[PDB]
Amino acid sequence: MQYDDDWQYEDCKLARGGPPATIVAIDEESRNGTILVDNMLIKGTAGGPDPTIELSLKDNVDYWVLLDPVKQMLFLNSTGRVLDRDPPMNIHSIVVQVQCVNKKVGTVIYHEVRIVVRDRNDNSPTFKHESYYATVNELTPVGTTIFTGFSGDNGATDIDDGPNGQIEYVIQYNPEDPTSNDTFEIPLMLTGNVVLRKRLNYEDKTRYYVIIQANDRAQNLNERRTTTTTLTVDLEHH
Amino acid sequence: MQVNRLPFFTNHFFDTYLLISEDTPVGSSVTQLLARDMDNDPLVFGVSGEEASRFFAVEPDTGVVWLRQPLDRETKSEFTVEFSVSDHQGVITRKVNIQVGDVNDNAPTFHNQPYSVRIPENTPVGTPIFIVNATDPDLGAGGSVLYSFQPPSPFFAIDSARGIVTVIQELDYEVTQAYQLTVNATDQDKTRPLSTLANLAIIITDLE
Ligand SMILES: [Ca+2]
Ligand SMILES: [Ca+2]
Ligand SMILES: [Ca+2]
Ligand SMILES: [Ca+2]
Ligand SMILES: [Ca+2]
Ligand SMILES: [Ca+2]
Ligand SMILES: [Ca+2]
Ligand SMILES: [Cl-]
Ligand SMILES: [K+]
């Protein structure tokens, strides 16, 4: 009967239903040998003494993926380097093709694999400068914004993606200048702009050391990262 | 006085990707945006960007995302889309990678047509005389082509994987001067295989 030989064509076809592409996710900077695909689920036997198929990798850009044809497993090859999702490497995904050749009939089927690289909160906020400064006139009204130096990446930045890379600024109490966190405020944590909260008096105090901490916005509070800078505020008379 | 707290998305898909099959019907919901606001503010959802906005729509009050026009993995296999959520005082955005899932929706296309070849009547059995080729852009089995004659010819065979045509029986010009064979190129999709026909003319040249 016609199609009685169709069994010969089964090797290299997927041994699973669902869509043709195989898509997985792994964390950036996973260690060498991390399993990417535990089992490609391709019909047939590769390797061994009587294989029915030949499996290999195509379009393996920079050789990030290693294939064990016997187990049909794909692993990360990252010895001597790191799979970095953040700049400057910017690896958000890896796409490779698992080429399958059917030995009996010579047909070739390509099984696309997409590895989605997840961002980790592996970077802390970093300030562009080692310290910040503002000069404020003694007559400045309370409520006036007196420092905007964190505007347009001059403050803290964080190279992670999403909330992991978004910054919040808060003023901390300074034991060596106790009144500084009472005299100045950051009412809007996203900008880090500093506002005068109390009337100044040049005859009493001429310099304030304001401790400002930047944190990122990682979902898990215990995975958040923080960095601190000092804003020195000097009063002017004239 | 409490300053406004801006809303934030909670979907876990923002940390990975969103997969939408290319056969998703227009008008169909593909996901629902979720967000929270520390002020308990009612939130309005949207989509930003020229090209994204042409493919996706968003119900403003629910965050339900739906398909505004058909997807086509063979025309565009992924989008980066920026979604928005607003509490009426500010708007925040966040991007997601959308991967377009494949379905078998193309038939093979033949290369180098038209197909015609002249061969002498004394061409030996086993001689390769012609090579057909077709390609197919779908993924996996849906893109792997098999060749056949429809119906099989007792004088010519075609390699199902390679498209090589061979003479399989001694020819006789006075019996048949020309053959018009139909070549079928099919993909190997399990549920919805697609195929295409091409003519192959084989002209037999006389010896006497
Ligand atoms: Ca990194
Ligand atoms: Ca970070
Ligand atoms: Ca990161
Ligand atoms: Ca709010
Ligand atoms: Ca398509
Ligand atoms: Ca397709
Ligand atoms: Ca196809
Ligand atoms: Cl040819
Ligand atoms: K960032």
Side-chain angles (χ1 to χ4, degrees), chain A residues 20 97 110 112, chain B residues 22 72-77 100-111 134-145 186-188 194 196:
Chain A
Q97 304 292 329
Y110 304 91
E112 183 164 289
Chain B
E22 66 173 331
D72 175 14
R73 193 202 67 85
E74 284 74 43
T75 288
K76 189 172 177 68
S77 62
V100 179
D102 190 54
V103 305
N104 189 50
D105 60 351
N106 295 264
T109 305
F110 286 95
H111 292 230
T135 55
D136 186 319
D138 294 304
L139 296 184
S144 182
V145 177
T186 185
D187 63 40
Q188 295 177 84
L194 296 172
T196 304

Short mmCIF file of all heavy atoms in Angstrom, two decimals, chain A residues 20 97 110 112, chain B residues 22 72-77 100-111 134-145 186-188 194 196:
data_model
loop_
_atom_site.label_atom_id
_atom_site.label_comp_id
_atom_site.label_asym_id
_atom_site.label_seq_id
_atom_site.Cartn_x
_atom_site.Cartn_y
_atom_site.Cartn_z
N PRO A 20 6.84 24.33 16.64
CA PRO A 20 8.13 23.81 16.19
C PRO A 20 9.36 24.30 16.95
O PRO A 20 10.27 23.49 17.18
CB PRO A 20 8.20 24.20 14.72
CG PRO A 20 6.92 24.88 14.39
CD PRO A 20 6.13 25.10 15.61
N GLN A 97 20.30 26.47 15.68
CA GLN A 97 19.50 25.47 14.99
C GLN A 97 20.08 24.10 15.29
O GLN A 97 21.28 23.90 15.16
CB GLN A 97 19.53 25.70 13.48
CG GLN A 97 19.09 27.07 13.04
CD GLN A 97 17.62 27.33 13.27
OE1 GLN A 97 16.81 26.41 13.22
NE2 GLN A 97 17.27 28.58 13.53
N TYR A 110 15.52 21.11 10.54
CA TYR A 110 16.16 22.01 11.48
C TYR A 110 15.21 22.34 12.61
O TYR A 110 14.07 22.76 12.38
CB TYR A 110 16.63 23.30 10.80
CG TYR A 110 17.57 23.08 9.63
CD1 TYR A 110 17.08 22.96 8.35
CD2 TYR A 110 18.94 22.96 9.81
CE1 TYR A 110 17.92 22.72 7.27
CE2 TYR A 110 19.78 22.73 8.73
CZ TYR A 110 19.27 22.62 7.47
OH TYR A 110 20.10 22.41 6.39
N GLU A 112 14.69 24.76 15.60
CA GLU A 112 15.13 26.03 16.13
C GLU A 112 15.05 26.06 17.65
O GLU A 112 14.07 25.62 18.24
CB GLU A 112 14.27 27.17 15.56
CG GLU A 112 14.71 28.53 16.00
CD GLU A 112 14.12 29.67 15.16
OE1 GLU A 112 14.53 29.81 13.99
OE2 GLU A 112 13.27 30.42 15.69
N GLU B 22 1.50 32.79 15.52
CA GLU B 22 1.10 33.58 14.35
C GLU B 22 -0.32 33.31 13.84
O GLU B 22 -0.84 34.13 13.08
CB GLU B 22 2.10 33.44 13.18
CG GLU B 22 2.17 32.07 12.58
CD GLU B 22 3.03 32.01 11.34
OE1 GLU B 22 3.13 33.05 10.62
OE2 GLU B 22 3.57 30.91 11.06
N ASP B 72 2.61 37.49 11.46
CA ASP B 72 3.16 36.61 10.40
C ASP B 72 4.61 36.41 10.71
O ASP B 72 5.43 37.30 10.46
CB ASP B 72 2.97 37.22 9.00
CG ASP B 72 3.63 36.40 7.92
OD1 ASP B 72 4.02 35.23 8.19
OD2 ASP B 72 3.77 36.91 6.80
N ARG B 73 4.95 35.23 11.23
CA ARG B 73 6.30 34.92 11.64
C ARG B 73 7.29 35.03 10.48
O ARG B 73 8.46 35.37 10.70
CB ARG B 73 6.37 33.52 12.23
CG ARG B 73 7.69 33.26 12.97
CD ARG B 73 8.02 31.83 13.11
NE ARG B 73 8.31 31.25 11.80
CZ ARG B 73 9.48 31.28 11.17
NH1 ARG B 73 10.57 31.80 11.74
NH2 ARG B 73 9.57 30.77 9.95
N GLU B 74 6.82 34.75 9.27
CA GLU B 74 7.66 34.83 8.08
C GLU B 74 7.89 36.28 7.62
O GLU B 74 8.81 36.52 6.80
CB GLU B 74 7.07 34.01 6.94
CG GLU B 74 7.26 32.52 7.07
CD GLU B 74 6.38 31.85 8.11
OE1 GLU B 74 5.17 32.16 8.22
OE2 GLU B 74 6.87 30.91 8.79
N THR B 75 7.07 37.23 8.09
CA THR B 75 7.24 38.67 7.75
C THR B 75 7.96 39.39 8.89
O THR B 75 8.83 40.24 8.65
CB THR B 75 5.89 39.36 7.43
OG1 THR B 75 5.40 38.89 6.17
CG2 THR B 75 6.04 40.87 7.34
N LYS B 76 7.58 39.06 10.13
CA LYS B 76 8.25 39.60 11.32
C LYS B 76 8.07 38.59 12.45
O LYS B 76 6.94 38.32 12.86
CB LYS B 76 7.64 40.95 11.69
CG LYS B 76 8.38 41.73 12.77
CD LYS B 76 7.78 43.13 12.88
CE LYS B 76 8.40 43.96 13.98
NZ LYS B 76 9.82 44.32 13.70
N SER B 77 9.18 38.06 12.96
CA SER B 77 9.15 36.97 13.94
C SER B 77 9.19 37.38 15.40
O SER B 77 9.11 36.53 16.30
CB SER B 77 10.33 36.05 13.71
OG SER B 77 11.53 36.76 13.90
N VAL B 100 7.02 35.48 18.05
CA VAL B 100 5.90 35.04 17.21
C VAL B 100 6.07 33.56 16.92
O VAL B 100 7.03 33.18 16.26
CB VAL B 100 5.81 35.84 15.88
CG1 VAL B 100 4.64 35.33 15.05
CG2 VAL B 100 5.67 37.37 16.18
N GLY B 101 5.16 32.74 17.43
CA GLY B 101 5.25 31.29 17.28
C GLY B 101 4.90 30.88 15.87
O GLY B 101 4.03 31.47 15.23
N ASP B 102 5.56 29.85 15.36
CA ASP B 102 5.33 29.40 14.00
C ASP B 102 4.18 28.42 13.89
O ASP B 102 3.94 27.62 14.81
CB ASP B 102 6.58 28.71 13.43
CG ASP B 102 6.48 28.45 11.94
OD1 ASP B 102 6.20 29.41 11.17
OD2 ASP B 102 6.68 27.31 11.51
N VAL B 103 3.46 28.50 12.78
CA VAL B 103 2.59 27.43 12.36
C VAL B 103 2.94 27.14 10.91
O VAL B 103 3.54 27.97 10.24
CB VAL B 103 1.11 27.72 12.53
CG1 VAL B 103 0.79 28.13 13.98
CG2 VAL B 103 0.66 28.78 11.56
N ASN B 104 2.62 25.94 10.44
CA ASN B 104 2.87 25.62 9.05
C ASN B 104 1.83 26.33 8.20
O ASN B 104 0.67 25.91 8.16
CB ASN B 104 2.85 24.10 8.79
CG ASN B 104 3.30 23.77 7.40
OD1 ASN B 104 4.35 24.25 6.99
ND2 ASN B 104 2.51 23.01 6.65
N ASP B 105 2.23 27.43 7.56
CA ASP B 105 1.28 28.19 6.74
C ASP B 105 1.79 28.55 5.36
O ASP B 105 1.12 29.32 4.64
CB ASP B 105 0.68 29.40 7.50
CG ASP B 105 1.70 30.41 7.98
OD1 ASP B 105 2.91 30.16 7.92
OD2 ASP B 105 1.28 31.51 8.44
N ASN B 106 2.92 27.96 4.95
CA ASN B 106 3.44 28.11 3.61
C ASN B 106 3.62 26.77 2.93
O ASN B 106 4.03 25.79 3.56
CB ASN B 106 4.80 28.83 3.58
CG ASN B 106 4.70 30.25 4.06
OD1 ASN B 106 4.59 31.18 3.23
ND2 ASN B 106 4.69 30.46 5.39
N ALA B 107 3.33 26.73 1.64
CA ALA B 107 3.65 25.59 0.82
C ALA B 107 5.03 25.83 0.22
O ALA B 107 5.49 26.99 0.17
CB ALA B 107 2.62 25.37 -0.28
N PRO B 108 5.70 24.76 -0.24
CA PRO B 108 7.00 24.97 -0.90
C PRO B 108 6.92 25.78 -2.20
O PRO B 108 5.87 25.82 -2.86
CB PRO B 108 7.49 23.56 -1.19
CG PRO B 108 6.74 22.69 -0.20
CD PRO B 108 5.41 23.32 -0.07
N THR B 109 8.02 26.43 -2.53
CA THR B 109 8.17 27.13 -3.81
C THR B 109 9.36 26.53 -4.56
O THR B 109 10.45 26.38 -4.01
CB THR B 109 8.38 28.62 -3.59
OG1 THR B 109 7.31 29.16 -2.80
CG2 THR B 109 8.46 29.36 -4.92
N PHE B 110 9.14 26.17 -5.82
CA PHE B 110 10.18 25.57 -6.66
C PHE B 110 11.13 26.61 -7.19
O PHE B 110 10.74 27.75 -7.41
CB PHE B 110 9.55 24.85 -7.85
CG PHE B 110 8.89 23.56 -7.51
CD1 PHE B 110 7.53 23.50 -7.25
CD2 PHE B 110 9.63 22.38 -7.47
CE1 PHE B 110 6.92 22.30 -6.96
CE2 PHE B 110 9.01 21.17 -7.20
CZ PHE B 110 7.64 21.15 -6.95
N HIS B 111 12.37 26.20 -7.41
CA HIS B 111 13.46 27.04 -7.90
C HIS B 111 13.79 26.66 -9.34
O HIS B 111 13.68 25.51 -9.73
CB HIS B 111 14.72 26.78 -7.06
CG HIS B 111 14.63 27.26 -5.65
ND1 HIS B 111 15.60 28.04 -5.07
CD2 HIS B 111 13.68 27.06 -4.70
CE1 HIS B 111 15.26 28.30 -3.81
NE2 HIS B 111 14.11 27.70 -3.57
N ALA B 134 13.01 22.80 -4.23
CA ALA B 134 12.01 23.68 -3.67
C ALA B 134 12.39 24.00 -2.24
O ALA B 134 13.06 23.20 -1.57
CB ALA B 134 10.63 23.03 -3.74
N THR B 135 12.02 25.18 -1.78
CA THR B 135 12.22 25.56 -0.40
C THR B 135 10.89 25.99 0.23
O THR B 135 9.89 26.23 -0.45
CB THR B 135 13.24 26.69 -0.26
OG1 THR B 135 12.83 27.79 -1.08
CG2 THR B 135 14.65 26.21 -0.64
N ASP B 136 10.92 26.07 1.55
CA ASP B 136 9.71 26.34 2.34
C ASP B 136 10.14 27.03 3.62
O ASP B 136 10.99 26.48 4.35
CB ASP B 136 9.04 25.00 2.62
CG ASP B 136 7.68 25.12 3.32
OD1 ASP B 136 7.51 25.96 4.25
OD2 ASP B 136 6.76 24.32 2.98
N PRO B 137 9.58 28.22 3.92
CA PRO B 137 10.05 29.05 5.02
C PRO B 137 9.58 28.72 6.42
O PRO B 137 10.08 29.31 7.38
CB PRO B 137 9.54 30.44 4.64
CG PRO B 137 8.25 30.16 3.97
CD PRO B 137 8.55 28.92 3.13
N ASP B 138 8.65 27.79 6.56
CA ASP B 138 8.15 27.42 7.87
C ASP B 138 9.21 26.68 8.65
O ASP B 138 10.16 26.17 8.06
CB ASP B 138 6.92 26.56 7.73
CG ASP B 138 5.74 27.31 7.13
OD1 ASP B 138 5.32 28.37 7.67
OD2 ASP B 138 5.21 26.82 6.13
N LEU B 139 9.05 26.61 9.96
CA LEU B 139 10.04 25.95 10.81
C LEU B 139 9.90 24.45 10.86
O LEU B 139 8.79 23.89 10.69
CB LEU B 139 9.96 26.48 12.25
CG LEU B 139 10.29 27.96 12.51
CD1 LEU B 139 10.25 28.31 14.00
CD2 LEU B 139 11.64 28.30 11.91
N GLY B 140 11.03 23.79 11.11
CA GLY B 140 11.02 22.35 11.40
C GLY B 140 10.44 21.50 10.29
O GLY B 140 10.77 21.68 9.11
N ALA B 141 9.58 20.56 10.66
CA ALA B 141 9.00 19.65 9.67
C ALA B 141 8.23 20.40 8.60
O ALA B 141 8.21 20.00 7.44
CB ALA B 141 8.11 18.62 10.36
N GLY B 142 7.60 21.49 8.99
CA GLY B 142 6.90 22.37 8.05
C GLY B 142 7.75 23.03 7.00
O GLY B 142 7.21 23.56 6.03
N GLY B 143 9.07 23.01 7.17
CA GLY B 143 9.99 23.57 6.21
C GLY B 143 10.87 22.56 5.49
O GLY B 143 11.75 22.96 4.72
N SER B 144 10.67 21.27 5.76
CA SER B 144 11.50 20.21 5.19
C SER B 144 10.73 19.57 4.06
O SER B 144 9.65 19.04 4.27
CB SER B 144 11.86 19.19 6.27
OG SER B 144 12.71 18.17 5.77
N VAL B 145 11.30 19.63 2.87
CA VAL B 145 10.62 19.24 1.64
C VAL B 145 10.89 17.81 1.18
O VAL B 145 12.02 17.33 1.21
CB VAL B 145 11.01 20.22 0.51
CG1 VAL B 145 10.39 19.82 -0.85
CG2 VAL B 145 10.59 21.66 0.89
N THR B 186 6.28 18.61 -1.11
CA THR B 186 5.46 18.77 0.10
C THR B 186 6.33 19.01 1.30
O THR B 186 7.44 18.51 1.38
CB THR B 186 4.57 17.53 0.37
OG1 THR B 186 3.70 17.77 1.49
CG2 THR B 186 5.41 16.27 0.65
N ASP B 187 5.84 19.80 2.25
CA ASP B 187 6.49 19.86 3.55
C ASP B 187 6.02 18.63 4.34
O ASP B 187 5.22 17.82 3.82
CB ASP B 187 6.26 21.18 4.27
CG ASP B 187 4.83 21.45 4.60
OD1 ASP B 187 4.13 20.52 5.00
OD2 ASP B 187 4.42 22.64 4.48
N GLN B 188 6.54 18.48 5.56
CA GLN B 188 6.27 17.31 6.40
C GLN B 188 5.54 17.65 7.70
O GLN B 188 5.64 16.94 8.69
CB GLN B 188 7.58 16.59 6.69
CG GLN B 188 8.19 16.00 5.43
CD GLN B 188 9.50 15.37 5.72
OE1 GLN B 188 9.57 14.20 6.13
NE2 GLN B 188 10.59 16.13 5.50
N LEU B 194 1.53 20.98 3.55
CA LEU B 194 1.22 21.80 2.41
C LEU B 194 2.14 21.43 1.27
O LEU B 194 3.32 21.12 1.49
CB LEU B 194 1.33 23.27 2.77
CG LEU B 194 0.33 23.74 3.82
CD1 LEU B 194 0.64 25.15 4.26
CD2 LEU B 194 -1.10 23.63 3.31
N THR B 196 2.98 21.74 -3.31
CA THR B 196 3.00 22.51 -4.53
C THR B 196 3.40 21.62 -5.68
O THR B 196 4.21 20.71 -5.52
CB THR B 196 4.03 23.63 -4.40
OG1 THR B 196 3.72 24.42 -3.23
CG2 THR B 196 4.07 24.52 -5.66
#
